[PDB]
Design a protein around this ligand. Sequence first.
Ligand SMILES: CO[C@H]1[C@@H](O)[C@H](O)[C@H](OC[C@@]23C[C@@H]4[C@H](C)CC[C@H]4[C@@]4(C=O)C[C@@H]2CC(C(C)C)[C@@]34C(=O)O)O[C@@H]1C
Ligand SMILES: Nc1nc2c(ncn2[C@@H]2O[C@H](COP(=O)(O)OP(=O)(O)O)[C@@H](O)[C@H]2O)c(=O)[nH]1
Length: 814
Amino acid sequence: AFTVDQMRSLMDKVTNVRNMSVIAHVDHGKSTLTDSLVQRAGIISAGITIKSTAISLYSEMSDEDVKEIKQKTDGNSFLINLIDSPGHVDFSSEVTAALRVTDGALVVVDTIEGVCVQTETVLRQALGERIKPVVVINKVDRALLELQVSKEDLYQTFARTVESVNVIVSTYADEVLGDVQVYPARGTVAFGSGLHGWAFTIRQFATRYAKKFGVDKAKMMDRLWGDSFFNPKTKKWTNKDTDAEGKPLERAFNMFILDPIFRLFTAIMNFKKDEIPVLLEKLEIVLKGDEKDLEGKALLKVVMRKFLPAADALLEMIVLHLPSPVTAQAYRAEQLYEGPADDANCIAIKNCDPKADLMLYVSKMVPTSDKGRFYAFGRVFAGTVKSGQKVRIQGPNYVPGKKDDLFIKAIQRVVLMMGRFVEPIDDCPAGNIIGLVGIDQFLLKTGTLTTSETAHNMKVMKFSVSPVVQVAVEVKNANDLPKLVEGLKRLSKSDPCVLTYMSESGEHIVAGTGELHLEICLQDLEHDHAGVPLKISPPVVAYRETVESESSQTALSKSPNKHNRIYLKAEPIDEEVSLAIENGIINPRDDFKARARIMADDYGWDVTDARKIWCFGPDGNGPNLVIDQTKAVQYLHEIKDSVVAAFQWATKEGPIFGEEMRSVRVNILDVTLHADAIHRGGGQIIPTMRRATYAGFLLADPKILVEIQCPEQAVGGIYSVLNKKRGQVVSEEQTPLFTVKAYLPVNESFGFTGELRQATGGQAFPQMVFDHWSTLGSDPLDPTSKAGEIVLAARKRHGMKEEVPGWQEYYDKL
Ligand SMILES: CO[C@H]1[C@@H](O)[C@H](O)[C@H](OC[C@@]23C[C@@H]4[C@H](C)CC[C@H]4[C@@]4(C=O)C[C@@H]2CC(C(C)C)[C@@]34C(=O)O)O[C@@H]1C
Ligand SMILES: Nc1nc2c(ncn2[C@@H]2O[C@H](COP(=O)(O)OP(=O)(O)O)[C@@H](O)[C@H]2O)c(=O)[nH]1
């Protein structure tokens, strides 16, 4: 329990600060270990609550210990910030953000399960942030109590776990950091049981046996680990595991450190009441009062706490091995800073200079109980931030030259982020973590605060990574729409791999990396983010409605009045031309003359037809056209707007099942109008044109990028699956892996990710994006053909009649 003054004093000696977190796979004991740390060294102040985000620990080392610290030290007191990290381990950006504010990590590994993918994933991300690791092989009690494992087996298990870990480290750690691997002999590996208050270092035992073996501890701790044997028969220390006769010698670690512990466990747990007093006496352990009566685990717990007070082992590795900002910002400056390496701000970062201009990185926005207000959490890399200070808020898109994302505003208050609470403070110099109030509106997620107009902005760690699984989300109660729209924003910000957007059909879409990911997202969206009943339903694939040939016969339709008639034919527009329209070569607003010269000279069009295009559709710019081929219609000019409008309507909603048209050309052959405009009005001609277009369309023989990375030998599975799903290979490129690109119908992609791992031995990684467009040759009007099935499914899904109205339905015989 410290006062604000004591805390602030502790925060001045950043050489004696440790910013770190605990990395662990679910159930490996991350929680019980931190409870242990908190109960042993947690710090507390001598009605606003927050979600626990970080905890402060306090530790004192002996004068000799502090001498062993291979880094700048000021005194024997240490302040340890145990920073909370998310539990989602999908290489998410929320995790990367949390690690970014730490410098070291306590990696928890299970005695039995060893290093699992989740563990490798966070560690890999950590190494990517140049974080130094230290390991704790947890749940050791399981191997002794449940599995009855033997000493050499337990040893071997420990050694294999340590090797698995140093494989990940040696693979992803920056060579510039040197050897960041972990070594039990160097004290960077702890062993124990977070559930059961005892731990040790070889050093403590060396101290204990040095003045007893008549040898200095430097010599003793080297002998208490690895291949050092003490032959009781010769009374000598050797490095050979056998004697002259070749008989097996027990390792010094086993003989002097493990055996005493093993004997204590065995004697106490088996109630050997005549063997316990002696053993305790020999180890100089003293039971006082009610303790003398304890037995079994109760006695054990109490005896081990006295003999070797877990937290102690962990704190020792944290203080002695994890890195302290002055030291680190010297080699981290350039990465952290986008600007010039010779820049005034970069230098201020390298020197962790508190008198320079401000360089404060906003790690994330944290939820507060202050009615919808989020406080900015971050770290001062340069300068010092002050309450009421005028600063420059630069979002993710800011550039020193443009005024994008820029926001000048005063910082309302600078607060210490202590667990769920805050503590207003006047200022905070470079090298410290801190919270800012009043930045809510201008920044959401990461950012960069500066006090220099020149200041440039600041920068992120081996499952699917593409949002291939998507559903439509909608409120059950219309009035809730606002909360949903807001919830999606909140959801997107908290999840890097989550995607939300509005569909062509007006539905909010939420897409996730995999079925499970999407499920968490929807649960969180509904329960928290939006907090309102949501309705989930089918991603729907969009299709286009086109024609394969010219109308088999002139289309004829009359107006409601029955006085007006339009005669037309529909024909295919060449792909190259549709593409040209879609991509900017042939444009709706270009000068009709020059455009017609291009369409005629370069695309084979008849220049008169081209000069006479009346409009593009849908939306006035789509790849469908109306060309005027009439000769002597008197009031043509007066119906043009109605005809154009009807086309925008027809091409927007095709007659097959309501999808947009594409590559459809319509030629107006003739129009017969009533002499009086009353009759001829849009309300008469718009329906006529739309009815005729649908008819010409139906009479024209109507018709309606998956990137995979993987090893060579696995590629064969890819072709195997694709062939089972109307797939089609596109490209096979490459000394990393391979990358196969192919087209995969959307209605053949449900469960694809599963069948692919199954066919590639879990070695292939898919990625999918909507691509097109390809014309299906089957009949859209035949409920049993490939195209027809798709059309029948969409029609039922929309509550339309199953049978597709045929052309005769829009044809008005003369
Ligand atoms: C960056 O992420 C990308 C990729 O996931 C992919 O390109 C995806 O495709 C979405 C679709 C896009 C197509 C174009 C807009 C026209 C046709 C559209 C589609 C309709 O069937 C095909 C894909 C899949 C879709 C339906 C089923 C949702 C599309 C849609 O948005 O409706 O879009 C997101 C934003
Ligand atoms: N046997 C054993 N179980 C442990 C140990 N530490 C934690 N556990 C158990 O493992 C489960 C998960 O522990 P927890 O601390 O919540 O792990 P986390 O979710 O990874 O942080 C709980 O049932 C614990 O009681 C340990 O050292 N030994």
